[PDB]
């Protein structure tokens, strides 16, 4: 028989998750008020 | 030159609406991405753990054939 | 040998999918017309 | 005070452009998310189905060693 | 009728801010999606490759039982 | 024993990835300048 090996990739999108959270915070702090 | 003032009002509210929902869009996308990462990585870990177990079994099976083939 | 168990996680982002579809509907219904 | 009217026009069109493409962005993200969910869950189901099959095989192998070890 | 000119300025900058970050949002979402596709497909390929290997092993085991069961 | 078969699904969201890249290019080319 054969020597089973797995070698599974692991997903790393922590930066994208965190950068998208920062976008959602920088927007929504972009309200535009007016007048007097 | 009277509609200008109303038009500035309309753009103002539409802009604040758009930003609020772009905000929501980003957060909801972030939330989906986080769940995907957790599940994909856990499913990978299981397969790895599974192959280790399958390898122990094949070793024990190989040992049994050798014990019985020479003890015969 | 060993007692192979799987315990696979299943992905549930139906709420996020559906909430993002509602965002795409609430936008695009945000056209801003003008004049007279 | 003449550019104001043209500027309101420019923001209007740019706003309606932005919303249209934010709309498209959300739908396209939704579509990717749906495909990911379907594939990740199906691949998980297969692995589960696979382990059941691997367990039946190891049981049948274990039975064979026992039958031959005592019938010997 | 003096605030109109300042208000057009405010919407202008806020619009260019919003588009810049909607741009960033799309690119960051694209980048996450690309990584997910690569990982999900590679993990699938491994499982497929793994099952082939597990099938070769079960065949070799089945052959051994048959050789020893008739040579006995 | 049993005839193990895998039948793994493969993910194809190349169109969505590419269409989202085009959105990010069509935005950001939507700056709005003014005056004289
Ligand atoms: Cl949520
Ligand atoms: Cl699509
Ligand atoms: Cl990035």
Residue numbers in the entry:
A (entry chain F), C (entry chain F), F (entry chain F): 1024 to 1059
B (entry chain C), D (entry chain C), E (entry chain C): 767 to 838
Provide passages from the article that reported this PDB entry.
Virus entry of CoV is mediated by its spike (S) protein, where its S1 domain facilitates attachment to host cells, and its S2 domain is involved in the subsequent fusion between the virus and host membrane. During the fusion process, two heptad repeats, HR1 and HR2, in the S2 domain, assemble into a six-helix membrane fusion structure termed the fusion core. The formation of a six-helix bundle (6-HB) fusion core brings the virus closer to the cell membrane and promotes membrane fusion and infection. In this study, we have determined the fusion core structures of CCoV-HuPn-2018 and SADS-CoV at 2.10 Å and 2.59 Å, respectively, thus further completing the structural profiles of α-HCoVs fusion cores.
Here, we designed a linked recombinant SADS-CoV S2 fusion protein (HR1-HR2) using N-terminal residues 764–842 and C-terminal residues 1025–1061, with a six-amino-acid linker (L6: SGGRGG) between the two regions. The structure was refined to a final resolution of 2.59 Å with Rwork of 23.4% and Rfree of 28.2%. HR1 of SADS-CoV forms a 19-turn α-helix trimer, while these residues first form the random coil tether (residues 1025–1036) and then a second heptad repeat region (HR2) between residues 1037–1050, followed by the other extended conformation residues 1051–1061. HR1s from three HR1-L6-HR2 (SADS-CoV) molecules are arranged around the crystallographic three-fold symmetry axis and also form the central hydrophobic core in an antiparallel manner, resulting in a six-helical bundle structure with dimensions of ~107 Å in length and 30 Å in diameter with a left-handed supercoil. The HR2 helices make five full turns and pack into the central HR1 trimer to form a highly stable six-helix bundle conformation that coordinates the fusogenic events between the virus and host cell membranes. Such a structure is typical for the CoVs fusion core and represents the post-fusion state of the SADS-CoV spike protein. Intriguingly, owing to a lack of 14 aa insertions, SADS-CoV harbors 19 turns in HR1. Consequently, HR2 motif of SADS-CoV has only five turns in the helix region, the first reported exception in α-HCoV genus. A structural comparison between SADS-CoV and SARS-CoV-2 fusion cores revealed a high degree of overall structural similarity with a root mean squared deviation (RMSD) of approximate 0.814 Å for 71 Cα atoms of a piece of HR1 protomer. Only three-pair polar side-chain to side-chain interactions were detected between the helical region of HR2 and HR1 of SADS-CoV.
